[PDB]
Structures are given as C-alpha cells and as structure tokens.
Amino acid sequence: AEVTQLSNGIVVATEHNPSAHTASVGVVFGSGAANENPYNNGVSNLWKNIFLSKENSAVAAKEGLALSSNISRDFQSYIVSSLPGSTDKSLDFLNQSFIQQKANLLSSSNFEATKKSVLKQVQDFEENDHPNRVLEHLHSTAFQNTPLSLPTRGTLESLENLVVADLESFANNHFLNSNAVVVGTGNIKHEDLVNSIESKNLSLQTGTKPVLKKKAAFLGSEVRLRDDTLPKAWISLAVEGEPVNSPNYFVAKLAAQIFGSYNAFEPASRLQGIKLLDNIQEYQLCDNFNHFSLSYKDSGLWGFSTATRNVTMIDDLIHFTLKQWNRLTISVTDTEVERAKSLLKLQLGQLYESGNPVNDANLLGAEVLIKGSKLSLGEAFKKIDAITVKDVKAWAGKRLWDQDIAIAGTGQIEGLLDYMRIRSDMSMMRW
C-alpha cells in the first residue's frame, strides 16, 4: 500500500490512490517546534508563512498549484497539491523556490509583511481561542524547561525579535536531506515520483541536525490563567501518556475512546454509551469534553479538555470524570472495550481514509519519518482487535492509577480546586 524507498540522500514515500482526482507532493521535515529555544520560538511559524506568502503563492496559482503547510511538535511539512497530470510542475515549484532559491522568499519587505501578519495572527490566537490556548498551556506546564514545552505558533514576545538571520540559521540547521521525507499522495505513482526526483537531481542540504541535550520529562504541575471576564471555564487536564512507537500506543487510544467526546447540545451526543454522561447530565456540569491521547517522539499526553458555564460545580465535574478514570484500573467492563474498539476503528478510518491528500501527506510524512515505514490500516485494526480488558487494566494501573497530573485552566476557574484535591482524586480508596 504505502511504499517507501531511499535515494542518494532522500527518503521518498508514496500512497498511490488511483481513484483520486488530485495529486499532492511535498517535503516533510523532522523538526517542528520541539527543536527550538525559548528565544527563537516561532521560527517554524515564520517559515510556514513565508512559504505561503502572496508572491510565493501567486507563482503557484499561475501554474494551478495550491500550497499547504503544517507546523507540529515533531515534524513540519510543506505540501504542493495539483491536478494528476501536473506533478512535475509541483516538484519544479517546490525545488526552485523553497529548496534551492529561497533568497526571494526571504526578501525584506516580504519578511516584514509576513512577520507583521504572523504577529497579528498569534495576538488574535492568545486572546480569542480559549480551548486551544489551554491545550498549549497544558503542554507548556507538563513538559516545562524541556523542548516539548514550546507552543507551535510561537510567542508574541519571542516573535518580535526574529530576523531573517534566524530563519536562514534554522534552515541551515534543520532543512536537510537526513531530516526530510518527500511524500506523494493522491494518484501519483511511486516510480514516476522517484523518476522525476532523480530526473531533476534534487538535493536539499548535506549536514546533520543538532541533537538535543535533554529529553522531554513530564512534570506534574499546574497553571491557572484565570480571567473573570470570560463567560465559560476551559480546563485541560492530563497525565503522562504513551509516545509513538509504544507497545501501549493503541491501548492509550482505546482508553481515551472509552470516555469519548461529548457535546451537550447535540441530541445524539447525549445518548452515547458512556457512564460519565449519567453523572454529568443531571445538573449539566459541562458543555463539552473530548478525551485525547497525544503521542510525540519523546513523551506523550493522555487526558481531557472541557468547557463549562457551570462555574459553581467545576470540582464535581473533575471529580466525576476522575472517578470514571479509576474504573479503567479496577472495573472496566467487556462492553466498554468492545464499544471503544468499534469507535476507535471508525475514528482511525476517518482520519487516515479521507478524501483529502494533504492530510494523507502530513500523516504519511510524520509516520515514515519517525519509524521508517507506515503501519497499514489493516494491521492497525488487527492490533486494535487484540486488546483485552487485562491490557486496559494493566495500562491504567501503570499510567493512570495514582499518578501526577498536569492542569491548565483559563476563564472563571475560581471553582476549580487546587492541585492536591484533584491529584488525590486520581486513586480512590477502594470503594
């Protein structure tokens, strides 16, 4: 299905899908925002946004190419998608303006306009988008003083000290042949992509990226960005979870799928088979929740996020969901595991098997970059079907039962109790 080969310096990965009507090539590097200082934080955002400038994207639009890019913790990608007959126009564009001739992109009077719009973008992020900024603050307090603690968008105080020297320094240090996968999704075939990446003699750079002196360590902590002038209360709360290439990767995904997501205002979201709903529905404790299992290279996160307007009963919402977490160690049933198996297979099928080949390019690039190949969906389903109740109980006794947590909150979180009551909720006194 996926095929992956290694050229003179570049690894190439394709997912050919002959019933698609767009093809999409690009390059996925292996250094997201986890490879920055607290002082050049926001360099990858500036590279994402100078790759998508108006004068860089006008050249792609005249040839019928649509640009896309993504900054994450581990990886970063730069994707050019077009019609199936014009894959080499895309490879030519990605070469001649991003890979080799990046001196017109890094023009001053282009850098200034892009830096100004990125500053405006993160300023409107930091004061209007409340669930995502507390997920970023959960990351920045769970992994503090380690490289995984950095926001992917950067920081308004960090971003206004950046110059073009920092962008080209990061480019020299990280945009390398040893760090990059060239991806192709859509109905581009593999032999045509390798034949046109050896037809042009495409070479990115020849160094090797710096290796970080400390690994990401989970520190049980809290942060409270309280603001009484906001309507709701947004609370994210997580334990240390599994990183990628765990053996407990799918067990963590399944254990997050057991408690699922919920929306108070959708009538078929109130009828789910979660036993948390018939504790939080009687007094309408929350508006929504979602249980996540975020996996990175070094470490991971496992927890939930809620937004609620019932600011008087936040502590009972937290108490009821953590007493529902305890059942994974003690008394999780057969049925909850089977239901979460079916829902997890559906969620992974909707994530991978989707029509958009930009998303397939991002997923294939990050997966092949971190473990050298890509696990198929049939093998993923055969690894999900093999999970038992004892695997969930063993994983929850390891990672959940009586462990330190990380909390982040904004809004009206006066009703949220301190660290120690919430942490003492993580293990019940066997009743």
Ligand X SMILES: CCCCCCCCCCCCCCCCCC(=O)OC[C@H](COP(=O)([O-])OCC(O)COP(=O)([O-])OC[C@@H](COC(=O)CCCCCCCCCCCCCCCCC)OC(=O)CCCCCCCCCCCCCCCCC)OC(=O)CCCCCCCCCCCCCCCCC
Contact stretch for other proteins (CB under 8 A) within 19-27, 321-329, 374-382, 416-424: 416-424
The pattern of x and - marking residues 167 through 206 that bind ligand X according to CB under 6 A reads: ----------------------------------------
Q: Beta-carbon neighbour count of residue 13 at 10 Å? A: 25
Q: Which of 66, 225, 343, 428 binds ligand X (CB under 6 A)?
A: 428
Binding mask 276-305 for other proteins (x = CB under 8 A): ------------------------------
Q: What contacts 250, CB < 8 A, 6 or more positions away?
A: 344, 380, 383, 384, 387
Residue 415 interacts, among ligand X, other proteins, none and using kind-specific CB cut-offs from 5 to 8 Å, with other proteins
Residue 312 interacts, among other proteins, ligand X, none and using kind-specific CB cut-offs from 5 to 8 Å, with: other proteins
Minimal distance, residue 315 CB to other proteins, in Å:
7
What distance in Å separates the CA atoms of residue 307 and residue 182, rounded to the nearest whole number?
Answer: 39
Residues 6+ apart with CB under 8 A from 277: 262, 270
Does 226 participate in binding other proteins (rule CB under 8 A)? yes
Shortest Cβ 239–ligand X spacing (Å): 18
- State in angstroms the smallest separation of the CB of 321 from ligand X: 13
Nearer to ligand X, 265 or 431 (CB): 431
Which of other proteins, ligand X, none binds 429 (CB below 5-8 Å, type-dependent)?
ligand X
How far from the centroid of its chain's Cα atoms is residue 282's Cα? Answer: 34
Contacts with other proteins in 310-369 (CB under 8 A)?
A: 311-315
Neighbour count for residue 278 (Cβ, 10 Å): 9
Cβ atoms of residues 83 and 22 within 8 Å: yes
Q: Does 126 bind other proteins (CB under 8 A)?
A: no
**Residue 276 CB contacts under 8 Å (≥ 6 apart), including other chains:** 259, 262, 320, 321, 324
* Max CA distance (Å), the chain: 69
Say whether residue 417 binds other proteins (CB under 8 A): yes
| SS3 labels along 175-190 | CCCCCEEEEEEECCCH
In sequence order, what DSSP letters do the residues of 126-146 get, joined into one string? Answer: HTT-HHHHHHHHHHHHHSTTS
Closest to ligand X by CB, 86 or 427: 427
CA nearest to 6, candidates 174, 181, 202: 181
Determine the interface stretch with ligand X among 12-20, 197-205, 396-404, 423-431 (rule: CB under 6 A).
Answer: 423-431
Of the two residues 356 and 403, which places its CB atom closer to other proteins in the complex? 403
Q: Are strands 288-295 and 300-308 parallel, antiparallel or unpaired?
A: antiparallel
Query: According to CB under 8 A, which one of 3, 66, 119, 225 is a site residue for other proteins?
Result: 225
Rounded CA gap, 299 and 354, in Å? 28
Give the x-and-dash track for 140-169 against other proteins (CB under 8 A).
-x----------------------------
What are the residues facing 321 on neighbouring strands? Answer: none
Site for ligand X in 319-348 (CB under 6 A): 319
9 touches other proteins by CB under 8 A: no
**Binding range to other proteins, per CB under 8 A, among 109-117, 204-212, 336-344, 418-426:** 418-426
> Residue type for 272, please?
Q
Checking 117-120 for CB contacts under 8 A at 24+ apart, the result is: 117/49, 118/42, 118/45, 118/46, 118/49, 118/154, 118/159, 119/156, 119/159, 119/160
Interaction with ligand X in 280-319: which residues (CB under 6 A)? 319
Residues 24-63 that bind ligand X (CB under 6 A): none
Specify the residue, 129 or 402, whose C-beta has the smaller distance to ligand X.
402
Residues that bind ligand X (CB under 6 A): 319, 428-429, 431
